[PDB]
Amino acid sequence: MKGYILLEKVNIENANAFNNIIVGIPAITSFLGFARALERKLNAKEIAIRINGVGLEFHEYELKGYKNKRGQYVTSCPLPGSIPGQNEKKLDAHIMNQAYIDLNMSFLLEVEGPHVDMSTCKSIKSTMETLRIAGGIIRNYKKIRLIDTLADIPYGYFLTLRQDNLNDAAGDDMLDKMIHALQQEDTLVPIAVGFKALSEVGHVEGQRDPEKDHCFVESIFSLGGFECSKILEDINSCLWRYKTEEGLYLCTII
Amino acid sequence: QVFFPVGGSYHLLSILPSTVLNYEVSDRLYRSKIPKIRLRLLSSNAAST
Amino acid sequence: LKSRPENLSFARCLNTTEAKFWQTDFLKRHTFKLPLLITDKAVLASKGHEMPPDKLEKEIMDPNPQKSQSCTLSTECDTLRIDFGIKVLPVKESMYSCSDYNYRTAIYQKIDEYIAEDGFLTLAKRYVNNIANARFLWRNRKGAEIIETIVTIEDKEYPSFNSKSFNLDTFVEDNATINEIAQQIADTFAGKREYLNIYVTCFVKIGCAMEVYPSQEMTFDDDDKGKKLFKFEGSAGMHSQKINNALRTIDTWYPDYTTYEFPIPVENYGAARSIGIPFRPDTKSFYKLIDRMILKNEDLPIEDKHYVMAILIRGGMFSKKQEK
Amino acid sequence: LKSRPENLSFARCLNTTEAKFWQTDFLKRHTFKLPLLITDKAVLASKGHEMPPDKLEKEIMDPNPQKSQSCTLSTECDTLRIDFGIKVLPVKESMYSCSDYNYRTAIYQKIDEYIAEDGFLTLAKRYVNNIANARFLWRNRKGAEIIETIVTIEDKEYPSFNSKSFNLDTFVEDNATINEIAQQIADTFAGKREYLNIYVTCFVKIGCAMEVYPSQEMTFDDDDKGKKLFKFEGSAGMHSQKINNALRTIDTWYPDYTTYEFPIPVENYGAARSIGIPFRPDTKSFYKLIDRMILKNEDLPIEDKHYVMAILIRGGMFSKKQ
RNA sequence: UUUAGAAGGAGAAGUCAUUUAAUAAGGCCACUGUUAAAAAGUGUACCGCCGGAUAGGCGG
Known part of the structure; x- marks a missing residue:
C-alpha cells in the first residue's frame, strides 16, 4: 500500500551550509541521510516501513551573517569554545571555514510497505522530535499529512536536477561549461549531489565503526533549478533517490 | 565520516576536500561575474599550519 | 578496557533556539507587543587608547570616525520581552558514535547506576534554578525594576517567577514549581520520557x-x-550559544571553591573566559575522572559524578588521543 | 601583581538616552507640544573656498550645487522642548571583564576606600550642575531668552531651574535641589541603591x-x-553620546588649570577640542596615574582620585599588550 | 545511521562652519451606456397571578 507523506513547514536553524566550494543550500546527501535515519529509527521500533524518494520544497531561507553595502554576503561563526588535541587548554581556539543557514521547508516522502495510514503519521510525528536535519535543529512544524493528489501540495518552489544544462555548454572541462551555463541562466545554482571514489574498499586503523567498508571519497557537484509547485509537471518527476555504481554514490531523480 | 546505504548494506565514507579545485574555482570566480562569497574566516598562521 | 575508544562522541541534551526581542508596556504585556529593530549609527571619538610615547606626540589631537549599531526601546514602551524555547533529550540515547563495544557497555552501566542512585535531580534543579533567576540576561539584567519569568511545558502555564529575589551565587531547592519542572526534566534525562519541550518568556521593566x-x-x-x-x-535577538552558556553555569564543585564562591560554566578543564585561569588543570579534570571511573573501576565521590554527568549532558568529542 | 591584566574593560555607569525635539508655546508650556521635523534644502554656493591661483582664474565664477537639510521652528511656536533620560548604576558592578583576581580585589578595595572618604558626592554635585546650567543644549543655548530645566525622579517633580543664572565656569554646590538630587546620585554610585532613573525636560525660548x-x-x-x-x-533629536559629553565636563584638576580656568571633558590624555592643546600628555595621564595607585600601591592627592573615579564612571577599554 | 559530533565577539566615543537654481513657452481635434429586476424576513414579545425563592411554575 504505497503512499506519500508530507511534512509541512519544518523549521531548521543553524543548518550546515559549507561544502568545499559551495555556500548556501546544503547538500542533497544530508536530506537523504536524514530520511534514511528516520527510516532506521522507525525500523528499530515496532512500526516497519520504508522510504524511497524525497522531495524538497523551499519556502524561506536566511544565511547566518549580513549583507554588505556592495551586495555581498558576510558570514558569521560561533565563538570556538574548545578543540581537542594540542593547545586544548588555552582560552582562544583556532578558526576554520564554516557557514550556517536557517531555512523553513516542506518534505514529501514516498513511503511504501504495510500499514500506511494515520497511525504511521502519528508515529512519524512522535519519532521526528529526536532528529537533526543537515546538522541543524528542528524547532517547529505545521503538521503531518497523507497526500495522494498533487493539488494538495502547498505553495512553494521545488528543487530538481538540471545536468542537461551543464552538459549543453561550451568549454572542454566541465568547470567552464558550468560557469557558462550559470551565466546564461540565473535560476540555475550549483549543488552537491554525491561522492566519488578515490581509493579501494578496505579497513584502516581508526574510524567511526570498524565493521563496515572504508573508502576515501570526494564531493560531487552538479547543477540544479527551482520549479514552482503550481506549475509542476508530475509528482514522480520531483523526487530524489539513491544511486550506487562502481564508487559513484549519488542522488538523482529518475 | 558518514554512512551510505550501498544496496542493503552500509559503507563508511572518509570525505576529503580538493584544495587544487578550490584554488582553481577561486581564480575562475575572480575572473567572472557570477555572485560569490569571500569567506575570509582564516588566518595566516592557521593557513601556514 | 585499556584506554578510551578511538572514536567516541556525544551530543547536547539541552538544545535552545534563537531568542527574539519584543517591546511592550508592562500593564498590557499579556495582550500586545511591538517589534524591536537595530539601528545603525556613527560616532566621532578621540584617540584615547594607550599609545607608545612616540606616536602619541604626533596623533594625540586626531579625530576618530567609527561605525556602530545600537538598539533602544521606544519612547512609549518601557518593557522588554524575550521569548525562546528548550528541547530536552535523554542522555543515554545521545552517544552518536562509539567505536568500541565494551566501553559502550561500561558507559551504559555507569549511567544506569547513576540514575538508580541519584536520579538526575540535582542537575535538573540547578538548571531550573538558572532559568528562574534569569541569568540569561548577561547585561540587560542590571538596572531592572521588575523581572518576571514564565515557563510552559506543552499547555500547562506554571506560575510566574520573580528573578530579582534570587541570589546568583546560591541555589534554591525548596520551591514547588521548581520541584515539578526539575522532576519532569530529570524524567526526560533518565530515559522515562522520549523528549521534552519548554517555552520561556521573560518580561523586564528596564525603563x-x-x-x-x-x-x-x-x-x-x-x-x-x-x-x-x-x-x-528582522528583529534584534540573542544567540543560542550565549543562552546555553548561562544555563550550564552550575559548577560549584571545582577545587578552591571556598576562595572564589561563584559558579562557573562546566567545561573540560574548568576554563572560564571571565576569570582567565583554568580551575581544573589537573587530576580534577574531566578526562582524569573518566579514566578513574571507566578504565580503572573506582567509586568516585558524588560531586565528581555530578560534574562528569554534567559534562556528558553538555556533549562534545571525548575520544582518545589520535595518533599518526 | 605587577602589570595590568591582558583583558580589562569598564562598562559605563551613566547611561543617557537620546533626546527628542518638540516645539510648543511658552505660555502653554504644560498644555501641548508639537512634533519638529527636518526639511531637505539644496544650496548654490559661488566657490568661496581657498584655491591655488592656477585654476582660480578659470574656476571662480562657476556655481556650486550641494544638498543639505535644516530644521526650524514653525510660525506659531517659539519654545523648543527637549526630553531625555539618565540611568545610574553602581560603580563597583561595572567591571565587564578582568583576566585576574588580584587586580579585581585591589580595585574593589580602592573603590571602598574612596567611598569611605568622599562618598562620590563631589562628582554627583558636578554632574547635577552640568545638568542644571544646560550645557547639553550646545548651539541651541546661544541667543536664548528663557531656559527652564525640570528634573523628575519616579513621581517626585523637583522644583524648576533658572538655567541662565548659572555660569559655565564655576560649579554651585549651595543649591538645595542640586544637593538633594546629588545625594540620590551618590547613593546609587556607592551602592546603597540598585539603580536610578532621572528624566530631564528642557524648555528653551528662542523666538x-x-x-x-x-x-x-x-x-x-x-x-x-x-x-x-x-x-x-521621525522627529529631530540629539545623539545620546553628545549629551554625555556635556555632562562629562567636570575636570578642573588638570595641570595648568590656573592659566585657563575652565572645565574640560574627562578624557584619558586630557584632550580638549575647544582649545586644541592636550592637558595630560605626561605622567598626569590616566594610564600613568592608575599604575601608581594600584600596582605601586602609593597614596595620591584627592584630585587625582577624583579624576580616576571620573574616568571609571565613563568607562573604557583599559587593556594591556603583553 | 545526515562534510556526523563542540562553541559568550566585547568594552569606549561631539561630525561641522559657510551658501542666489534661473531665464522662455498654444495640448489639440472626433465619439450612441445599454437592455432586466418582489426588501421581505411573523416586526416585536402585553396585562396580570402562585411564587415571601431573582428557585421554578399558570390565565387571556
Missing part, C-alpha cells in the same frame, strides 16, 4: 526609552571593522 | 520661526556627500 543589549556577531571584513548586532528575522 | 540645531550624522566617503541630520522616531 522608558532605555537601551537593550542584543548579541553581537563575529564577522571579518577588510573595509568595515565596526560593531554588528544579531538580527533575527 | 518665533527660528532655527534649531540637532545632531549631524557622520558620513564616510562611501555613500554620498551632503549634510544629514539625526532623526529619532
Whole structure:
C-alpha cells in the first residue's frame, strides 16, 4: 500500500551550509541521510516501513551573517569554545571555514510497505522530535499529512536536477561549461549531489565503526533549478533517490 | 565520516576536500561575474599550519 | 578496557533556539507587543587608547570616525520581552558514535547506576534554578525594576517567577514549581520520557526609552571593522550559544571553591573566559575522572559524578588521543 | 601583581538616552507640544573656498550645487522642548571583564576606600550642575531668552531651574535641589541603591520661526556627500553620546588649570577640542596615574582620585599588550 | 545511521562652519451606456397571578 507523506513547514536553524566550494543550500546527501535515519529509527521500533524518494520544497531561507553595502554576503561563526588535541587548554581556539543557514521547508516522502495510514503519521510525528536535519535543529512544524493528489501540495518552489544544462555548454572541462551555463541562466545554482571514489574498499586503523567498508571519497557537484509547485509537471518527476555504481554514490531523480 | 546505504548494506565514507579545485574555482570566480562569497574566516598562521 | 575508544562522541541534551526581542508596556504585556529593530549609527571619538610615547606626540589631537549599531526601546514602551524555547533529550540515547563495544557497555552501566542512585535531580534543579533567576540576561539584567519569568511545558502555564529575589551565587531547592519542572526534566534525562519541550518568556521593566543589549556577531571584513548586532528575522535577538552558556553555569564543585564562591560554566578543564585561569588543570579534570571511573573501576565521590554527568549532558568529542 | 591584566574593560555607569525635539508655546508650556521635523534644502554656493591661483582664474565664477537639510521652528511656536533620560548604576558592578583576581580585589578595595572618604558626592554635585546650567543644549543655548530645566525622579517633580543664572565656569554646590538630587546620585554610585532613573525636560525660548540645531550624522566617503541630520522616531533629536559629553565636563584638576580656568571633558590624555592643546600628555595621564595607585600601591592627592573615579564612571577599554 | 559530533565577539566615543537654481513657452481635434429586476424576513414579545425563592411554575 504505497503512499506519500508530507511534512509541512519544518523549521531548521543553524543548518550546515559549507561544502568545499559551495555556500548556501546544503547538500542533497544530508536530506537523504536524514530520511534514511528516520527510516532506521522507525525500523528499530515496532512500526516497519520504508522510504524511497524525497522531495524538497523551499519556502524561506536566511544565511547566518549580513549583507554588505556592495551586495555581498558576510558570514558569521560561533565563538570556538574548545578543540581537542594540542593547545586544548588555552582560552582562544583556532578558526576554520564554516557557514550556517536557517531555512523553513516542506518534505514529501514516498513511503511504501504495510500499514500506511494515520497511525504511521502519528508515529512519524512522535519519532521526528529526536532528529537533526543537515546538522541543524528542528524547532517547529505545521503538521503531518497523507497526500495522494498533487493539488494538495502547498505553495512553494521545488528543487530538481538540471545536468542537461551543464552538459549543453561550451568549454572542454566541465568547470567552464558550468560557469557558462550559470551565466546564461540565473535560476540555475550549483549543488552537491554525491561522492566519488578515490581509493579501494578496505579497513584502516581508526574510524567511526570498524565493521563496515572504508573508502576515501570526494564531493560531487552538479547543477540544479527551482520549479514552482503550481506549475509542476508530475509528482514522480520531483523526487530524489539513491544511486550506487562502481564508487559513484549519488542522488538523482529518475 | 558518514554512512551510505550501498544496496542493503552500509559503507563508511572518509570525505576529503580538493584544495587544487578550490584554488582553481577561486581564480575562475575572480575572473567572472557570477555572485560569490569571500569567506575570509582564516588566518595566516592557521593557513601556514 | 585499556584506554578510551578511538572514536567516541556525544551530543547536547539541552538544545535552545534563537531568542527574539519584543517591546511592550508592562500593564498590557499579556495582550500586545511591538517589534524591536537595530539601528545603525556613527560616532566621532578621540584617540584615547594607550599609545607608545612616540606616536602619541604626533596623533594625540586626531579625530576618530567609527561605525556602530545600537538598539533602544521606544519612547512609549518601557518593557522588554524575550521569548525562546528548550528541547530536552535523554542522555543515554545521545552517544552518536562509539567505536568500541565494551566501553559502550561500561558507559551504559555507569549511567544506569547513576540514575538508580541519584536520579538526575540535582542537575535538573540547578538548571531550573538558572532559568528562574534569569541569568540569561548577561547585561540587560542590571538596572531592572521588575523581572518576571514564565515557563510552559506543552499547555500547562506554571506560575510566574520573580528573578530579582534570587541570589546568583546560591541555589534554591525548596520551591514547588521548581520541584515539578526539575522532576519532569530529570524524567526526560533518565530515559522515562522520549523528549521534552519548554517555552520561556521573560518580561523586564528596564525603563522608558532605555537601551537593550542584543548579541553581537563575529564577522571579518577588510573595509568595515565596526560593531554588528544579531538580527533575527528582522528583529534584534540573542544567540543560542550565549543562552546555553548561562544555563550550564552550575559548577560549584571545582577545587578552591571556598576562595572564589561563584559558579562557573562546566567545561573540560574548568576554563572560564571571565576569570582567565583554568580551575581544573589537573587530576580534577574531566578526562582524569573518566579514566578513574571507566578504565580503572573506582567509586568516585558524588560531586565528581555530578560534574562528569554534567559534562556528558553538555556533549562534545571525548575520544582518545589520535595518533599518526 | 605587577602589570595590568591582558583583558580589562569598564562598562559605563551613566547611561543617557537620546533626546527628542518638540516645539510648543511658552505660555502653554504644560498644555501641548508639537512634533519638529527636518526639511531637505539644496544650496548654490559661488566657490568661496581657498584655491591655488592656477585654476582660480578659470574656476571662480562657476556655481556650486550641494544638498543639505535644516530644521526650524514653525510660525506659531517659539519654545523648543527637549526630553531625555539618565540611568545610574553602581560603580563597583561595572567591571565587564578582568583576566585576574588580584587586580579585581585591589580595585574593589580602592573603590571602598574612596567611598569611605568622599562618598562620590563631589562628582554627583558636578554632574547635577552640568545638568542644571544646560550645557547639553550646545548651539541651541546661544541667543536664548528663557531656559527652564525640570528634573523628575519616579513621581517626585523637583522644583524648576533658572538655567541662565548659572555660569559655565564655576560649579554651585549651595543649591538645595542640586544637593538633594546629588545625594540620590551618590547613593546609587556607592551602592546603597540598585539603580536610578532621572528624566530631564528642557524648555528653551528662542523666538518665533527660528532655527534649531540637532545632531549631524557622520558620513564616510562611501555613500554620498551632503549634510544629514539625526532623526529619532521621525522627529529631530540629539545623539545620546553628545549629551554625555556635556555632562562629562567636570575636570578642573588638570595641570595648568590656573592659566585657563575652565572645565574640560574627562578624557584619558586630557584632550580638549575647544582649545586644541592636550592637558595630560605626561605622567598626569590616566594610564600613568592608575599604575601608581594600584600596582605601586602609593597614596595620591584627592584630585587625582577624583579624576580616576571620573574616568571609571565613563568607562573604557583599559587593556594591556603583553 | 545526515562534510556526523563542540562553541559568550566585547568594552569606549561631539561630525561641522559657510551658501542666489534661473531665464522662455498654444495640448489639440472626433465619439450612441445599454437592455432586466418582489426588501421581505411573523416586526416585536402585553396585562396580570402562585411564587415571601431573582428557585421554578399558570390565565387571556
